[PDB]
Amino acid sequence: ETISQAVPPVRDWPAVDLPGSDFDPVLTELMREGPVTRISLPNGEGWAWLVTRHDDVRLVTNDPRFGREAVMDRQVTRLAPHFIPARGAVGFLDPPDHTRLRRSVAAAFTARGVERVRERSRGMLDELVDAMLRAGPPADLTEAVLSPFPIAVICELMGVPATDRHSMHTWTQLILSSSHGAEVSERAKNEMNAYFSDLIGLRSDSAGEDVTSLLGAAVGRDEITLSEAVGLAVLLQIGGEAVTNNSGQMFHLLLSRPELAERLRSEPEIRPRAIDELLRWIPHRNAVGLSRIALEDVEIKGVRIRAGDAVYVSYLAANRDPEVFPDPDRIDFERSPNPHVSFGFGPHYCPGGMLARLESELLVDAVLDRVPGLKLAVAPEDVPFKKGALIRGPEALPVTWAAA
Numbered sequence: 001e002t003i004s005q006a007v008p009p010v011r012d013w014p015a016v017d018l019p020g021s022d023f024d025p026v027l028t029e030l031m032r033e034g035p036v037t038r039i040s041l042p043n044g045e046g047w048a049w050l051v052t053r054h055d056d057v058r059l060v061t062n063d064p065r066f067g068r069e070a071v072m073d074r075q076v077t078r079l080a081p082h083f084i085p086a087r088g089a090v091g092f093l094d095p096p097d098h099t100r101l102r103r104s105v106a107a108a109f110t111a112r113g114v115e116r117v118r119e120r121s122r123g124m125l126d127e128l129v130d131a132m133l134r135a136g137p138p139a140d141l142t143e144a145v146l147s148p149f150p151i152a153v154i155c156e157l158m159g160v161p162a163t164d165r166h167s168m169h170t171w172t173q174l175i176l177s178s179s180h181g182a183e184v185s186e187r188a189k190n191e192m193n194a195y196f197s198d199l200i201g202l203r204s205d206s207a208g209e210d211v212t213s214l215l216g217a218a219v220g221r222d223e224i225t226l227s228e229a230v231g232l233a234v235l236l237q238i239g240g241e242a243v244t245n246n247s248g249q250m251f252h253l254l255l256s257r258p259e260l261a262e263r264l265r266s267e268p269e270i271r272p273r274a275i276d277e278l279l280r281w282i283p284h285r286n287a288v289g290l291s292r293i294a295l296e297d298v299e300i301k302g303v304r305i306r307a308g309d310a311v312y313v314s315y316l317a318a319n320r321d322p323e324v325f326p327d328p329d330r331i332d333f334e335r336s337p338n339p340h341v342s343f344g345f346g347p348h349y350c351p352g353g354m355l356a357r358l359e360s361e362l363l364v365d366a367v368l369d370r371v372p373g374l375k376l377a378v379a380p381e382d383v384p385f386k387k388g389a390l391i392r393g394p395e396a397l398p399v400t401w402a403a404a
């Protein structure tokens with residue numbers, strides 16, 4: 001048999017700030033280089049395997065042979081200089097303990113669970129849009145609505161007092177502050193942990209329907225520990241703001257493509273399906289996030305991943321799999337059943353998925369039918385996008401409307 005090379009060379013993935021919603025050039029190359037590539041990220045040390053195919057991504061994220069707990073030991077090559085989740089956060093937990101934790105709050109995040117805050121959220125959103133409308137056209141949609149709304153929704157769901165929403169925002173953005181935007185990210189985390197530790201123990205150690213109350217109850221019943229409860233609460237709190245960045249890309253996109261905006265304006269009933277297609281297409285993050293370690297040797301597409309090897313999956317690349325989504329780069333609100341993985345896959349799939357779709361749907365209705373002829377106040381490429389960040393998205397979204 002002819003001797004051939006199955007292991008591709010390590011490709012350095014330097015931190016680059018991509019304009020708007022353009023797809024990452026490097027990722028594109030990795031995708032065509034092969035199903036299983038190897039990469040080197042800005043921080044950490046060494047390399048890690050990278051799986052970009054929709055089928056292999058589902059495998060690596062839904063297989064017990066790959067774990068999260070083992071990532072804490074060494075320091076896998078990564079984007080952020082620090083690790084976002086705490087030692088016992090669900091992010092770093094594996095099935096046994098992980099299943100126990102996710103179970104404690106799953107009821108609050110199902111389609112039926114979030115639909116309960118539907119009307120209430122709609123009200124909070126109308127207040128924010130009403131204030132933007134009252135202040136006069138010239139406005140930053142992100143500062144006026146995209147940031148405030150998601151913050152208020154997750155704080156109300158978590159049971160965080162309105163007076164502390166400002167603190168939640170500051171810490172979250174420092175922890176996700178490109179992580180390399182500084183190093184107070186670690187301090188930010190500590191302060192967030194301390195905050196939820198108090199909240200979960202403070203009063204919430206009784207009745208309530210909010211998540212910290214539910215967690216307080218579970219800790220009280222010895223079902224989960226306080227550290228587990230806190231790590232999960234913090235990840236949920238930071239995750240809540242992901243809608244700010246994502247919807248920001250949604251509106252920049254919509255306002256950049258009149259045909260897409262016109263279709264949603266005239267057909268409010270197709271909005272749910274459209275948003276889901278937008279969720280598939282939108283490049284939610286820079287590079288990759290949290291790897292998994294091979295707990296034993298595993299062969300993927302003719303490549304042997306050795307036990308101890310770190311492996312990343314790219315949900316963004318999986319969402320562009322030509323075999324799963326024909327004409328991947330094309331935005332088709334009709335697109336067949338499109339099983340996108342923007343909300344992840346496997347046990348760690350995003351508990352906030354349904355809430356994010358609910359928030360995006362409420363936002364689309366309000367922004368399109370509540371604001372008369374809203375449009376970018378500047379040329380599409382002039383819209384600033386977060387420089388140095390984990391979750392891509394507008395730095396600010398300058399808009400104006402027919403009113404004034």
Ligand code: HEM
Binds near residue numbers: 090246347
């Ligand atoms: C369109 C908005 C959102 C997107 C695109 C998104 C995407 C993701 C992705 C890709 C993951 C990683 C899955 C993995 O570990 O393989 C994740 C995890 C997570 N997300 Fe989201 N998310 C969004 C909104 C939210 C919201 C609003 C919340 C809070 C209710 C949230 C809470 C979480 C948590 C707690 C995890 C960690 C789950 C675990 O490790 O068990 N997410 N999300």
Ligand SMILES: O=C1C(O)=CC(=O)c2c(O)cc(O)cc21
Binds near residue numbers: 291
């Ligand atoms: O682990 C990841 C990950 O690998 C990629 C992500 O985008 C992500 C995210 O958006 C939120 C998270 O809580 C975790 C992750």
Ligand SMILES: O=C1C(O)=CC(=O)c2c(O)cc(O)cc21
Binds near residue numbers: 176238239285289390
């Ligand atoms: O962006 C990342 C990221 O790059 C790595 C993460 O682990 C992570 C996370 O655990 C939770 C988040 O909300 C976001 C991230």
